[model samples]
Target: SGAIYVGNYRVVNRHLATHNDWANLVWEDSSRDLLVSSTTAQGCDTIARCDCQTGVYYCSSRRKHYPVSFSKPSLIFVEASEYYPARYQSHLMLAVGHSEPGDCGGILRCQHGVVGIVSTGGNGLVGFADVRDLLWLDE
Candidate 1:
């Protein structure tokens, strides 16, 4: 672990990993209570045909959605708002709110970069954070 911009951070790009030959460069920006991580990926999957103009994050990977609000992780006083994007890649996790028309399955939302803990679909959503760092863990 090294130092990130927000300070106290680390990066693991070429580091060995499990499953998938593709180096799942993991960034642990999830520090500071919400920060995830940051990394240096030379090549990207280059996808994001549309913005979250329709209560969805994007349209790819067979799933893309956004949030008009979020479920407070706290068991009590759960709060939500309108249009808050995850800083990086977000995952469909628990507490993910859905106020849009019909149940969007509470499609997780983000700012086109912020990401959530994968493999933890509906953990549910912990995106649009200003403290989370760039991380690469299978949720």
Candidate 2:
């Protein structure tokens, strides 16, 4: 089976001490399993796993975009598999944001980047791993 490439992006603003994080990318594996991740000051981050069979990306951690919310919504499958050339096949992007605290609401919009597999609902599920790790996988 082919590999799924998940990527990241960072929003930089001088005034704000903390950056606004967004899990904006997702890629589906050859098995049809969806791989998702977010981008932050830290780097490309995994948000959760979307079971291709079930068509649901379960949140594996608290809503990172929202400071006070605990419940995060899942990403429903929007389209079937469409093939692209190498380095482009896994390029599915999304913009994620929360409207208010505790509400834990948000939306996903296509932008650019790779996606990985993981969940954002449970504990110990926040932030991205080191870029070195991601690079190693790319090798």
Candidate 3:
């Protein structure tokens, strides 16, 4: 999900920080404050409920939902597989993983750096991997 190109942040004076390839996974009418995708999901169910305080938050790494009342929402580990490409990369960094979308992992692509996954850009899931690593993608 991280490497999968996602929609650019909703523009404003600055880009809005939404943290999922798709927002409103559970909630509606509201997008996230940060957009990140990783694979540290413990498959836990501590953060999947709907009824909660108004300040409910979702951390990208945990895939768990929490309300601000419980703890300030934030990520606690490193799992962004495609945060930087050839542009920001050292011309040496390579890929390590993917989240399996339309592989359906159908859930969604990550929010940050996400824009369009088309016939041009590498496919949806591994689209943002560095060019060196990108060659692994035959499409």
TM-score of each: 0.25, 0.17, 0.16
Instruction: Output candidate 2 Cα RMSD.
Output: 14.5
Q: How do the residues 1-139 of candidate 2 rate in per-residue lDDT, one tens digit apiece?
A: 1122233433211111122222353222322223333444344434233312111222323333222212223322323323322232222222232222222112221122322322111123221111122343332
Candidate 1 lDDT by residue in tens digits, 1-139? 1112222222221111223323332332222122224344432322222233222332223344444443322222122323222323222224353232222212233455333222122233333222132232212
- Ranked by TM-score from best down, the candidates are 1, 2, 3
- State the TM-score for model 2: 0.17
RMSD of each: 12.4, 14.5, 17.5
> Could you tell me how far off, in angstroms, the CA of residue 115 lies in candidate 2 after the best superposition?
3.8
Question: In model 1, what is the error at residue 73, expressed in angstroms?
Answer: 7.3
Over the stretch 1-139, how does candidate 3's per-residue lDDT look in tens digits?
Answer: 2223223222110012245534423211111112232222322212122222123222233464332222122222223233322222111111122323222111211222111111102222121111112221112
* Number of the top-ranking candidate, with TM-score as the measure: 1
Task: Decide which is better by TM-score, 2 or 3.
Answer: 2
Root mean square deviation (Cα) for candidate 1: 12.4
Candidate 1 segments exceeding 4 Å error: 1-41, 44-64, 71-93, 97-109, 121-131, 135-139
